[PDB]
Ligand SMILES: [Ca+2]
């Protein structure tokens with residue numbers, strides 16, 4: 123039977139930004155991996171564990187709790203690596219490896235970075251299995267926020283005011299209703315934007331070094347920060363977009379590899395996480411926007427992402443909106 | 458609160474094939490509508506009831522059971538037709554009109570024509586409210602089936618055999634798994650195709666004249682027919698596509714207007730209904746394919762579409778596959 127959704131896995135590998143960033147980021151670290159052992163947390167179809175072997179790792183432990191672990195084992199064997207790469211079913215928290223490892227690799231990032239991510243699992247595996255001084259791939263993550271005028275949203279809202287010119291029936295009254303429906307909710311919306319949509323310079327509001335003491339406690343407390351920016355020009359402000367990048371150490375190239383999900387960079391399967399205001403706000407060149415954004419666990423469920431937004435536009439009063447990912451949203455690691 | 462999904466309604470009106478076919482089909486029938494009364498079954502946002510008034514109807518009763526009926530009333534008033542077009546909430550089976558009507562107009566077609574359609578409601582309204590000899594817009598529907606080699610599916614299945622050439626990891630073992638996942642189910646798949654995908658001449662297998670005696674009983678019994686065709690050339694056969702057209706009488710133009718959902722015609726929001734075999738079947742030029750297809754009500758739920766397929770490819774034995782629309786599929790009239 124088909125428990126995993128094959129279409130999620132093909133979208134992962136069809137994401138050439140993601141796949142080549144990992145391939146090259148792993149290869150950059152040849153000197154550290156050469157003849158060493160690796161734990162791949164959440165190995166999926168196995169492609170990253172095989173990249174590690176191809177980068178010269180001696181042994182790779184590919185741990186995967188989903189149904190797809192079976193396919194990973196077949197992929198490993200098909201590439202003649204069954205000797206070197208061992209696929210282990212189940213959560214990393216209770217697997218037993220025969221040895222501690224020199225490195226951990228993982229595709230752990232969720233939508234919004236921290237929705238249904240495997241970061242907690244990576245941190246647990248680091249604590250339990252990673253040797254002193256060991257390597258983490260990627261090693262860090264950064265979080266960004268920017269105000270947006272979503273041109274696609276603008277088009278959908280204004281579309282009702284356009285019906286008269288195409289069919290001779292005025293439907294501009296439908297715009298209020300469309301606004302309430304499309305913006306008057308507190309759901310985090312996963313959608314891809316372009317640079318067209320970015321309304322002011324993006325602001326880094328958090329940085330996470332995976333090896334650093336205290337990170338798991340920070341995750342429970344909330345990952346966030348204040349921000350301030352000035353709008354590029356006149357537009358309807360629709361809200362904010364959140365995205366991330368992760369960085370692979372450069373190894374002997376001394377050039378880190380950055381995998382970005384910015385709308386100013388090539389699209390990826392993570393898209394961006396959109397936080398819409400209840401309705402559009404007109405802004406102008408040099409309109410000031412400040413606030414604070416915090417990524418939080420939900421109370422019911424720590425891997426359900428909550429985002430608490432405080433914002434102030436120009437002279438308006440500061441407002442707050444508390445967002446969360448919907449129950450029925452798209453899945454990556456927990457299908 | 459937002460009970461209706463505004464995005465379904467914008468997709469309807471953004472379907473320029475659908476919207477202009479109704480606009481023009483209604484206008485073709487000016488002589489029959491001039492000064493007459495109309496019942497619009499499932500009026501939605503109201504655009505079709507307003508088209509009817511613009512085509513010269515004296516009075517239009519716009520009946521709509523969904524939440525959107527409120528917006529339809531505002532649209533009517535905004536166009537200054539509140540005198541002539543009356544919006545009536547609730548199902549047509551229990552509305553009371555002050556008079557029988559000269560015509561019925563309705564956008565009743567569902568996915569696959571008969572998934573979650575309003576045809577039954579249109580037939581009930583005809584019986585109860587349409588005058589002797591009255592007009593139905595559209596007046597008839599035709600059902601088509603064709604064998605397909607879905608190039609998009611072909612690409613997704615073969616993608617795993619392509620990974621080696623892009624990333625140097627052989628993942629061709631994933632193709633079997635992908636096939637079982639994407640084809641080894643009995644779900645009707647709503648997806649848009651192009652003529653590229655059509656593997657033999659399409660075959661009309663049913664025709665429904667809405668005014669004809671016995672239609673509602675035929676719906677309960679199953680709407681279907683046998684078919685036979687010869688493949689255009691060498692391809693993997695993935696299954697069959699079902700689509701429909703409806704026809705508006707021509708009025709004094711003597712040229713009926715056909716609204717088609719064929720993949721050889723401009724795309725529409727109805728797309729096509731795809732019936733995949735459990736795995737691909739190679740065929741060649743002049744490979745014979747015959748069988749029978751029946752659109753049926755589901756036992757649990759008469760507006761849940763079931764499709765019973767019998768087929769024989771070339772010299773292979775005749776096979777059967779019993780499909781139905783998934784609980785979690787997309788909605789049009791019943792949101
Ligand atoms: Ca989920």
Ligand SMILES: [Ca+2]
Pocket residue numbers: 573784786787788791
């Ligand atoms: Ca449904």
